[PDB]
Amino acid sequence: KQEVTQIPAALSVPEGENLVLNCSFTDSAIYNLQWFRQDPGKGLTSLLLIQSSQREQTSGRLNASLDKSSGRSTLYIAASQPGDSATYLCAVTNFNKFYFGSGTKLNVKPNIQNPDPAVYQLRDSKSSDKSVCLFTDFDSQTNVSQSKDSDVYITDKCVLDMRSMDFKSNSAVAWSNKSDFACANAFNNSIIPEDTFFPSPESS
Amino acid sequence: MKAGVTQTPRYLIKTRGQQVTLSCSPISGHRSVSWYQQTPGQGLQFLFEYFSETQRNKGNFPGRFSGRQFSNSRSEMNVSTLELGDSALYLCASSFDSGNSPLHFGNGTRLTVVEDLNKVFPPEVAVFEPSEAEISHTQKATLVCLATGFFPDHVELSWWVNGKEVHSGVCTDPQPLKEQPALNDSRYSLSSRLRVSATFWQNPRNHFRCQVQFYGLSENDEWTQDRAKPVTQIVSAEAWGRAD
């Protein structure tokens, strides 16, 4: 009869903004409520544990309230950072059971200071039969879509940080081994900046 | 120094009907050990918790899921009569007291249950060298590594520059893409980028390696196909800088 609900399912925001993560539970007879983060391909990290007798806990930029009788907890994350990106899980400990919510998947986007959107062709590999195109250096407002073609593969924006240069950049990779494939067309199903640089012939 | 929660094995590939036994060692001083199953579709689900060698609490799984705890607090769980939907991350957590003290999780055992070990393939791995136009326009140079055609998703990708593992300037996709999204046994692909300065790429003494560890079949799994047995292995690709 315990049901734990978390909203939003997914949150994407600009770095620096405050965030609100909501948890609710139908059975108020809990011993503790606990918030965790989980990164891709890893286990969970405990962030806060709020005992049933406590109303809140704080650790750094994280503060969570517990309203036991209302069946609610809210996690507030101040001044979000890229390294906050994770899945955040709400769990409750009941008399003789333990229940986890389905999570909020948080992505905190960098503010790109100097966008320079471009689509480049990487060099042919002599030990691969794929052609590879790199869409890079675009602002974090850009959305990368899948191709119309089932044999063209496109991976979502990924942020890299060149720490010693004070520099971060988004990119998406597209590839295929079909012959009617070119970098000029690879991202045609996405809305890309009108000023995107297509070098001749890192494109077509 | 301290050891965290440890789990063994890290990865398993089984066929339907088989059985597995998984182990977890708690943090020293923790006596409560809990097991959970994490699947895409049902999220984290509680199996059972042990303290001082006895089961204290149990979830709703059927009796083919079982567990135990030894006198030193180490715990095993066992799954019999395995089915495709038992594929999951099996997570262990330890605590000083689960009623009032935080759960500390291990990194899990990744179990894949398949119909047919012929469905298992290692990755092919390739490095693609940077675009000249990128170098001219930005004074930076992005390498791409692609790991493709693998099943199951039991891979770990890393970059190494002159023998030292790098994280600065890297981004690896958080999840692989299914090459055939509609299929239970689709093979996967994964991409990663490493970006360096143009000056660094232009030195021919600089060596770049993309390494993919793939966790596959055991010595004891039978193999009767023509192609190479898809055992646990590293597949890598490399490049050297160049005046570019």
Coordinates of C-alpha atoms in Angstrom, one line a residue:
Chain A
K1 CA 0.0 0.0 0.0
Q2 CA 3.0 2.4 0.1
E3 CA 3.4 4.2 -3.2
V4 CA 6.4 6.7 -3.6
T5 CA 6.0 9.3 -6.5
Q6 CA 8.7 11.7 -7.7
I7 CA 8.2 14.7 -10.1
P8 CA 9.4 15.9 -12.4
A9 CA 10.6 12.7 -14.2
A10 CA 13.3 14.7 -16.0
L11 CA 14.6 18.3 -15.5
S12 CA 17.0 20.1 -17.8
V13 CA 18.1 23.6 -16.7
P14 CA 20.9 26.1 -17.1
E15 CA 23.7 26.0 -14.6
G16 CA 23.4 28.5 -11.8
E17 CA 19.6 28.1 -11.3
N18 CA 18.1 26.7 -8.1
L19 CA 16.2 23.4 -8.5
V20 CA 13.2 21.7 -6.7
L21 CA 12.8 17.9 -6.6
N22 CA 9.5 16.6 -5.2
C23 CA 8.8 13.3 -3.5
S24 CA 5.5 12.0 -2.0
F25 CA 4.4 8.9 -0.2
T26 CA 1.0 7.5 0.6
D27 CA 1.8 5.9 3.9
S28 CA 2.9 8.3 6.6
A29 CA 4.2 5.5 9.0
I30 CA 7.9 5.8 8.0
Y31 CA 11.1 5.6 10.0
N32 CA 13.2 7.8 7.7
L33 CA 13.2 9.3 4.2
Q34 CA 16.5 9.3 2.3
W35 CA 17.7 11.1 -0.9
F36 CA 20.3 9.6 -3.2
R37 CA 22.1 10.5 -6.4
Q38 CA 23.0 7.9 -9.1
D39 CA 25.4 8.5 -12.0
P40 CA 25.2 6.4 -15.3
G41 CA 26.8 3.0 -14.8
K42 CA 27.2 3.4 -11.0
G43 CA 25.5 2.6 -7.7
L44 CA 23.8 5.2 -5.4
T45 CA 25.3 7.8 -3.1
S46 CA 23.4 8.9 0.0
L47 CA 22.9 12.7 0.1
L48 CA 20.5 13.2 3.1
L49 CA 18.7 11.1 5.7
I50 CA 15.8 12.7 7.5
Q51 CA 14.5 10.8 10.5
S52 CA 10.8 10.5 11.0
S53 CA 11.1 13.0 14.0
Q54 CA 13.0 15.7 11.9
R55 CA 11.6 18.4 9.7
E56 CA 14.7 19.1 7.5
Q57 CA 18.3 18.3 6.8
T58 CA 20.9 20.4 5.1
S59 CA 24.3 19.5 3.5
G60 CA 26.1 22.2 1.5
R61 CA 23.9 23.3 -1.4
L62 CA 21.3 20.7 -0.6
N63 CA 18.3 21.1 1.8
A64 CA 15.4 18.8 2.2
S65 CA 12.2 19.2 4.1
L66 CA 10.1 16.4 5.5
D67 CA 6.3 16.8 6.2
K68 CA 5.5 13.3 7.4
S69 CA 1.8 13.9 8.0
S70 CA 1.4 15.4 4.5
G71 CA 3.4 12.5 3.0
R72 CA 5.9 14.9 1.3
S73 CA 9.6 15.7 1.0
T74 CA 11.1 18.4 -1.1
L75 CA 14.8 18.5 -2.1
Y76 CA 16.1 22.0 -2.9
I77 CA 19.5 22.2 -4.8
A78 CA 20.9 25.7 -4.7
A79 CA 23.0 27.2 -7.5
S80 CA 23.1 24.2 -9.7
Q81 CA 26.3 22.9 -11.3
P82 CA 27.1 20.6 -14.1
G83 CA 28.4 18.0 -11.7
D84 CA 24.9 17.8 -10.1
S85 CA 23.7 16.0 -13.3
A86 CA 22.5 12.6 -12.0
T87 CA 19.4 10.6 -11.2
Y88 CA 18.0 11.6 -7.9
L89 CA 16.0 8.9 -5.9
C90 CA 13.7 9.3 -3.0
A91 CA 13.3 6.3 -0.6
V92 CA 11.3 5.6 2.4
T93 CA 11.9 3.0 5.2
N94 CA 8.6 1.5 6.4
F95 CA 8.2 -0.9 9.3
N96 CA 9.4 -4.0 7.4
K97 CA 9.8 -2.8 3.7
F98 CA 11.8 -0.3 1.8
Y99 CA 10.5 1.7 -1.2
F100 CA 12.2 3.7 -3.9
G101 CA 10.7 6.3 -6.2
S102 CA 11.3 6.2 -9.9
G103 CA 13.7 9.2 -9.9
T104 CA 14.2 12.6 -11.3
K105 CA 16.8 12.6 -14.1
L106 CA 18.6 15.9 -13.8
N107 CA 20.7 17.5 -16.5
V108 CA 22.4 20.9 -15.6
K109 CA 23.7 22.5 -18.9
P110 CA 26.8 24.7 -19.2
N111 CA 26.5 28.3 -20.3
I112 CA 28.6 28.4 -23.4
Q113 CA 30.4 31.7 -23.4
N114 CA 31.5 31.8 -27.0
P115 CA 29.3 29.6 -29.3
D116 CA 31.0 28.7 -32.6
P117 CA 28.7 26.1 -34.1
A118 CA 30.3 23.9 -36.8
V119 CA 30.0 20.5 -38.5
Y120 CA 33.3 18.8 -39.2
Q121 CA 34.2 15.6 -41.0
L122 CA 36.7 13.5 -39.2
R123 CA 39.4 11.7 -41.1
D124 CA 38.6 8.2 -42.6
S125 CA 40.0 5.3 -40.3
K126 CA 41.9 2.7 -42.1
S127 CA 40.6 0.1 -39.7
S128 CA 36.9 1.2 -39.8
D129 CA 34.4 1.3 -42.6
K130 CA 32.4 4.2 -41.0
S131 CA 32.2 7.9 -42.0
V132 CA 32.0 10.2 -39.0
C133 CA 30.8 13.8 -38.6
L134 CA 31.1 16.0 -35.6
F135 CA 28.6 18.8 -34.8
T136 CA 30.3 20.9 -32.1
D137 CA 30.6 24.2 -30.3
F138 CA 26.9 25.1 -30.3
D139 CA 25.0 26.8 -27.5
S140 CA 23.2 24.6 -24.9
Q141 CA 19.7 25.7 -26.2
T142 CA 20.4 23.6 -29.3
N143 CA 18.5 20.3 -29.5
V144 CA 20.0 17.4 -31.5
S145 CA 17.5 15.1 -33.3
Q146 CA 17.9 11.5 -34.5
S147 CA 18.3 11.0 -38.3
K148 CA 15.4 10.2 -40.6
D149 CA 17.6 7.3 -41.8
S150 CA 17.7 4.0 -39.7
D151 CA 21.3 3.4 -40.7
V152 CA 22.6 6.8 -39.6
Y153 CA 23.5 6.9 -36.0
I154 CA 23.5 10.2 -34.0
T155 CA 24.4 10.5 -30.3
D156 CA 23.0 13.4 -28.2
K157 CA 24.9 16.4 -27.1
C158 CA 27.7 15.6 -24.7
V159 CA 29.6 18.3 -22.8
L160 CA 33.4 18.1 -22.5
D161 CA 35.4 20.4 -20.2
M162 CA 39.0 21.5 -21.0
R163 CA 39.7 22.7 -17.5
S164 CA 43.2 24.2 -18.0
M165 CA 41.8 26.4 -20.9
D166 CA 38.6 27.5 -19.0
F167 CA 36.6 26.0 -21.8
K168 CA 33.6 23.8 -22.3
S169 CA 31.9 22.6 -25.4
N170 CA 28.9 20.6 -26.6
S171 CA 29.1 18.0 -29.4
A172 CA 27.1 15.4 -31.1
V173 CA 28.5 12.6 -33.3
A174 CA 26.9 11.2 -36.4
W175 CA 28.1 8.2 -38.4
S176 CA 27.2 5.7 -41.0
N177 CA 28.6 3.2 -43.5
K178 CA 26.1 3.8 -46.2
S179 CA 27.6 5.5 -49.3
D180 CA 24.8 8.2 -49.7
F181 CA 25.9 9.9 -46.5
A182 CA 27.7 13.2 -46.2
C183 CA 28.4 15.6 -43.3
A184 CA 26.6 18.4 -45.2
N185 CA 23.3 16.3 -44.6
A186 CA 24.0 14.4 -41.5
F187 CA 22.2 16.8 -39.1
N188 CA 19.4 17.8 -41.5
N189 CA 16.7 16.6 -39.1
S190 CA 17.9 18.9 -36.4
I191 CA 17.3 22.6 -35.9
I192 CA 20.8 24.0 -36.0
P193 CA 22.0 27.5 -35.8
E194 CA 21.7 29.3 -39.0
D195 CA 25.4 30.5 -38.8
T196 CA 26.7 26.9 -38.4
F197 CA 30.1 26.6 -40.2
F198 CA 30.3 23.8 -42.8
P199 CA 33.9 23.8 -44.1
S200 CA 34.5 22.6 -47.6
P201 CA 34.7 19.6 -47.5
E202 CA 34.1 18.8 -43.7
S203 CA 30.6 18.6 -45.2
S204 CA 29.9 18.6 -49.1
Chain B
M1 CA 42.6 3.6 2.1
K2 CA 39.2 2.3 3.1
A3 CA 37.3 -0.2 1.1
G4 CA 33.7 0.7 0.2
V5 CA 31.0 -1.9 -0.3
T6 CA 32.4 -4.6 -2.6
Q7 CA 30.4 -6.9 -5.0
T8 CA 31.6 -9.8 -7.0
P9 CA 31.3 -10.7 -9.9
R10 CA 31.0 -7.4 -11.7
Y11 CA 29.4 -8.8 -14.8
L12 CA 27.6 -12.1 -15.8
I13 CA 26.1 -13.5 -18.9
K14 CA 23.8 -16.5 -18.5
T15 CA 21.3 -18.5 -20.5
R16 CA 17.7 -19.1 -19.5
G17 CA 17.2 -21.7 -16.7
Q18 CA 20.7 -21.3 -15.2
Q19 CA 21.4 -20.1 -11.7
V20 CA 23.8 -17.5 -10.2
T21 CA 25.2 -16.7 -6.8
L22 CA 26.3 -13.1 -6.1
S23 CA 28.4 -11.8 -3.1
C24 CA 28.6 -8.5 -1.3
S25 CA 31.0 -7.4 1.5
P26 CA 29.8 -4.5 3.6
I27 CA 31.8 -1.6 4.8
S28 CA 33.8 -2.6 7.9
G29 CA 31.6 -2.0 10.8
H30 CA 28.3 -2.2 8.9
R31 CA 26.2 -5.2 9.9
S32 CA 23.0 -4.6 7.8
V33 CA 23.2 -5.8 4.2
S34 CA 20.4 -5.2 1.8
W35 CA 19.9 -6.4 -1.9
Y36 CA 18.0 -4.6 -4.6
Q37 CA 17.2 -5.3 -8.3
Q38 CA 17.4 -2.4 -10.7
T39 CA 15.7 -2.7 -14.0
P40 CA 14.8 0.0 -16.6
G41 CA 11.1 -0.8 -16.4
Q42 CA 10.6 -1.3 -12.6
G43 CA 13.5 0.9 -11.2
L44 CA 15.0 -0.2 -7.8
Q45 CA 13.0 -3.0 -6.0
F46 CA 13.9 -4.4 -2.6
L47 CA 14.9 -8.1 -2.4
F48 CA 15.8 -8.6 1.3
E49 CA 18.0 -7.4 4.2
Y50 CA 20.2 -9.4 6.5
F51 CA 21.7 -8.6 10.0
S52 CA 23.7 -10.9 12.2
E53 CA 23.2 -13.9 9.9
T54 CA 19.4 -13.7 9.7
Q55 CA 16.9 -12.3 7.2
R56 CA 15.3 -9.3 8.9
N57 CA 13.1 -8.0 6.1
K58 CA 12.0 -9.4 2.6
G59 CA 10.4 -7.8 -0.5
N60 CA 7.9 -9.4 -2.9
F61 CA 10.1 -11.5 -5.2
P62 CA 9.3 -15.3 -5.7
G63 CA 11.2 -18.0 -3.9
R64 CA 13.7 -18.6 -6.7
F65 CA 15.3 -15.4 -5.3
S66 CA 17.1 -16.2 -2.0
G67 CA 19.8 -14.9 0.3
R68 CA 22.1 -15.5 3.3
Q69 CA 24.6 -13.8 5.5
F70 CA 27.8 -15.2 7.0
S71 CA 29.3 -14.5 10.5
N72 CA 31.6 -11.8 9.1
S73 CA 28.5 -10.0 7.6
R74 CA 29.4 -10.9 4.0
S75 CA 26.1 -11.7 2.2
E76 CA 25.2 -13.9 -0.9
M77 CA 22.1 -13.9 -3.0
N78 CA 21.1 -16.6 -5.4
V79 CA 18.7 -16.6 -8.4
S80 CA 17.4 -19.9 -9.9
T81 CA 15.7 -20.7 -13.1
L82 CA 16.8 -17.5 -14.8
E83 CA 14.6 -15.7 -17.3
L84 CA 15.3 -12.8 -19.7
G85 CA 13.5 -10.3 -17.4
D86 CA 15.9 -11.1 -14.6
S87 CA 18.5 -9.1 -16.5
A88 CA 19.3 -6.2 -14.1
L89 CA 21.8 -4.5 -11.9
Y90 CA 21.8 -6.4 -8.6
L91 CA 22.8 -3.8 -6.0
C92 CA 24.1 -4.3 -2.5
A93 CA 23.8 -1.7 0.3
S94 CA 25.4 -1.8 3.7
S95 CA 24.5 0.3 6.7
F96 CA 25.3 0.5 10.4
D97 CA 21.5 0.3 11.0
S98 CA 19.0 0.7 8.1
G99 CA 16.3 2.1 10.4
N100 CA 18.3 5.3 11.2
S101 CA 21.6 5.4 9.3
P102 CA 22.4 5.9 5.6
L103 CA 22.5 3.2 3.1
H104 CA 25.9 2.9 1.3
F105 CA 25.7 1.1 -2.1
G106 CA 28.1 -1.0 -4.0
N107 CA 28.4 -0.7 -7.8
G108 CA 26.4 -3.8 -8.4
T109 CA 26.5 -7.0 -10.4
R110 CA 25.4 -6.5 -14.0
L111 CA 23.5 -9.7 -15.0
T112 CA 22.4 -10.3 -18.6
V113 CA 20.2 -13.4 -19.3
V114 CA 20.0 -14.3 -23.0
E115 CA 18.4 -17.0 -25.1
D116 CA 21.5 -18.0 -26.9
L117 CA 25.3 -17.3 -26.3
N118 CA 25.5 -16.8 -30.1
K119 CA 23.9 -13.4 -29.4
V120 CA 27.1 -12.3 -27.7
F121 CA 29.6 -10.1 -29.6
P122 CA 32.6 -8.0 -28.5
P123 CA 32.9 -4.4 -29.7
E124 CA 34.8 -3.2 -32.7
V125 CA 36.8 -0.1 -31.7
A126 CA 38.0 2.7 -33.9
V127 CA 39.6 6.1 -33.5
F128 CA 38.9 8.9 -35.9
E129 CA 41.5 11.6 -36.2
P130 CA 40.7 15.3 -36.1
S131 CA 39.4 17.5 -38.8
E132 CA 42.0 19.9 -40.4
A133 CA 39.2 22.5 -40.6
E134 CA 38.5 22.2 -36.8
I135 CA 42.2 22.7 -36.2
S136 CA 42.4 25.9 -38.4
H137 CA 39.2 27.4 -37.1
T138 CA 39.5 26.7 -33.4
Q139 CA 43.0 25.8 -32.5
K140 CA 41.6 22.6 -30.9
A141 CA 41.4 19.0 -32.2
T142 CA 38.7 16.5 -31.4
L143 CA 39.3 12.7 -31.7
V144 CA 36.3 10.4 -31.7
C145 CA 36.2 6.8 -30.5
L146 CA 33.4 4.5 -31.6
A147 CA 32.7 1.1 -29.9
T148 CA 30.2 -0.7 -32.1
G149 CA 28.4 -4.0 -32.6
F150 CA 28.6 -5.3 -29.0
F151 CA 26.1 -7.4 -27.0
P152 CA 25.4 -7.3 -24.1
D153 CA 26.1 -3.8 -22.8
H154 CA 29.0 -4.9 -20.6
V155 CA 31.6 -2.3 -21.7
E156 CA 33.9 0.3 -20.1
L157 CA 35.5 2.9 -22.3
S158 CA 38.5 5.0 -21.3
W159 CA 41.1 7.3 -22.9
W160 CA 44.8 7.2 -22.3
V161 CA 47.4 9.8 -23.5
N162 CA 51.0 8.7 -23.3
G163 CA 50.0 5.9 -21.1
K164 CA 48.1 8.1 -18.5
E165 CA 44.2 7.9 -18.2
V166 CA 42.6 11.2 -19.1
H167 CA 39.3 12.7 -18.0
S168 CA 39.9 16.4 -19.0
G169 CA 38.5 17.1 -22.5
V170 CA 36.5 13.8 -22.6
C171 CA 32.9 13.1 -23.0
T172 CA 31.5 9.6 -23.4
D173 CA 27.8 9.0 -24.1
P174 CA 26.0 8.1 -20.8
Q175 CA 24.2 5.1 -22.6
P176 CA 24.8 3.2 -25.8
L177 CA 22.5 3.4 -28.7
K178 CA 20.7 0.2 -30.0
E179 CA 21.8 -0.4 -33.6
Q180 CA 18.3 -2.1 -34.1
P181 CA 16.0 -0.4 -31.5
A182 CA 13.1 -2.8 -32.0
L183 CA 15.0 -6.0 -30.9
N184 CA 15.6 -7.5 -27.5
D185 CA 19.0 -8.8 -28.7
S186 CA 20.1 -5.7 -30.6
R187 CA 23.7 -4.9 -30.6
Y188 CA 24.9 -1.6 -29.2
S189 CA 27.2 1.3 -30.2
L190 CA 28.9 3.9 -28.0
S191 CA 30.7 7.1 -28.9
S192 CA 33.3 9.2 -27.0
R193 CA 35.3 12.4 -27.7
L194 CA 38.7 13.5 -26.6
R195 CA 39.6 17.2 -27.3
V196 CA 43.1 18.6 -27.1
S197 CA 44.8 21.7 -28.2
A198 CA 46.0 21.9 -31.8
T199 CA 49.6 22.3 -30.6
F200 CA 49.3 19.0 -28.6
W201 CA 47.8 17.1 -31.5
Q202 CA 50.5 18.4 -33.8
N203 CA 53.3 16.7 -31.8
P204 CA 54.0 13.3 -33.4
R205 CA 55.3 12.0 -30.1
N206 CA 51.9 12.2 -28.5
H207 CA 50.1 8.8 -28.4
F208 CA 46.3 8.5 -27.9
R209 CA 44.5 5.2 -27.1
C210 CA 40.8 4.5 -26.7
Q211 CA 40.4 1.3 -24.6
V212 CA 37.2 -0.7 -24.3
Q213 CA 37.0 -3.5 -21.7
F214 CA 34.3 -6.0 -22.6
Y215 CA 33.0 -8.5 -20.1
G216 CA 31.8 -11.6 -22.0
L217 CA 31.7 -15.4 -21.8
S218 CA 33.5 -17.6 -19.2
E219 CA 36.1 -20.3 -19.8
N220 CA 33.3 -22.7 -18.9
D221 CA 30.7 -21.6 -21.4
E222 CA 30.5 -23.8 -24.5
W223 CA 31.3 -22.3 -27.8
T224 CA 30.6 -24.1 -31.2
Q225 CA 30.4 -21.2 -33.6
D226 CA 33.0 -20.4 -36.3
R227 CA 33.7 -17.0 -35.1
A228 CA 36.1 -16.3 -32.2
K229 CA 34.6 -17.1 -28.7
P230 CA 33.5 -13.7 -27.3
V231 CA 35.4 -14.0 -24.0
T232 CA 36.2 -11.1 -21.6
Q233 CA 38.7 -8.9 -23.5
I234 CA 40.1 -5.5 -24.2
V235 CA 39.6 -4.0 -27.6
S236 CA 41.5 -0.8 -28.3
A237 CA 42.5 1.6 -31.1
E238 CA 45.2 4.3 -31.2
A239 CA 46.6 7.3 -33.0
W240 CA 49.8 9.4 -32.9
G241 CA 49.8 13.2 -33.3
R242 CA 51.0 14.6 -36.6
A243 CA 52.0 18.0 -38.1
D244 CA 48.1 18.6 -39.0

